[PDB]
Design an enzyme around this catalytic site. Structure first.
Site, short mmCIF file in Angstrom:
data_model
loop_
_atom_site.label_atom_id
_atom_site.label_comp_id
_atom_site.label_asym_id
_atom_site.label_seq_id
_atom_site.Cartn_x
_atom_site.Cartn_y
_atom_site.Cartn_z
N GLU A 52 -8.72 -27.34 3.44
CA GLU A 52 -8.61 -27.29 4.89
C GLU A 52 -9.94 -27.03 5.58
O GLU A 52 -10.25 -27.69 6.58
CB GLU A 52 -7.62 -26.21 5.27
CG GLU A 52 -6.19 -26.60 5.00
CD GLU A 52 -5.28 -25.41 5.11
OE1 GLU A 52 -5.74 -24.36 5.64
OE2 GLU A 52 -4.13 -25.52 4.65
N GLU A 103 -4.34 -33.13 10.19
CA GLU A 103 -3.58 -32.78 8.97
C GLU A 103 -4.24 -33.31 7.74
O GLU A 103 -4.74 -34.44 7.68
CB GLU A 103 -2.13 -33.22 9.07
CG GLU A 103 -1.43 -32.41 10.18
CD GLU A 103 0.00 -32.79 10.45
OE1 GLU A 103 0.45 -33.84 9.95
OE2 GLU A 103 0.68 -32.04 11.18
N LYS A 116 4.40 -39.31 2.27
CA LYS A 116 3.83 -38.18 3.02
C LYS A 116 2.98 -38.64 4.21
O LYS A 116 3.06 -38.06 5.29
CB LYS A 116 3.03 -37.27 2.06
CG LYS A 116 2.29 -36.11 2.72
CD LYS A 116 3.20 -35.15 3.46
CE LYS A 116 2.43 -33.86 3.70
NZ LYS A 116 3.04 -33.16 4.87
#
Length: 171
Positions: A52, A103, A116
């Site tokens: 992230e 994301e 996904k």
């Protein structure tokens, strides 16, 4: 035994995790665990965090460390919104009325990767329409990866860490 293997995998992380202050809290969260399930959980969170932080650094986004929803993010910038679908992004950046949302995800098998991608895409595209009515322009970014590899730990260490943490579940 179990104490020995747990001590060993921590030792692995102490040697190889990059000396990055933004990882300190979660590194310590991992190092204080004594039970295999707790250890696994905190170890996966550490790898997730590394990813992230990399994805946000690459994309110039603020890292959403507090898991704020989009509604919360906009409210913190003085912006009120209609009812939005609930979305918690990995990174964001608000510049006037242009909102970038990021994301990121990992899927090592292509079929899952494609499923996904469609999942995240749909969540993000729901927001776009709704923010338009409040003259916020949404720029949705999806950073889908095929592995947990990242800039904060060697790839071979990464593999060994995940392997070990799941195995420890032996105890």
């Amino acid at each position: 035994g179990m104490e020995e293997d747990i001590a060993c995998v921590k030792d692995l992380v102490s040697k190889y995790l990059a000396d990055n202050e933004r990882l300190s809290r979660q590194k310590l969260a991992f190092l204080v665990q004594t039970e295999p399930r707790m250890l696994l959980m905190e170890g996966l969170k550490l790898l997730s965090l590394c990813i992230e932080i990399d994805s946000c650094n690459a994309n110039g986004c603020e890292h959403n460390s507090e898991d704020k929803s989009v509604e919360r993010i906009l409210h913190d910038h003085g912006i009120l919104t209609p009812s939005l679908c609930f979305v918690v992004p990995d990174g964001y950046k608000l510049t006037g009325n242009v909102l970038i949302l990021l994301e990121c995800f990992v899927r090592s098998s292509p079929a899952n990767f494609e499923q996904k991608y469609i999942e995240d895409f749909k969540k993000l595209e729901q927001l776009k329409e709704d923010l338009k009515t409040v003259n916020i322009s949404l720029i949705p970014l999806i950073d889908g990866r095929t592995s947990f590899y990242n800039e904060q730990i060697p790839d071979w260490v990464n593999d060994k860490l995940r392997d070990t943490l799941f195995s420890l579940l032996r105890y």
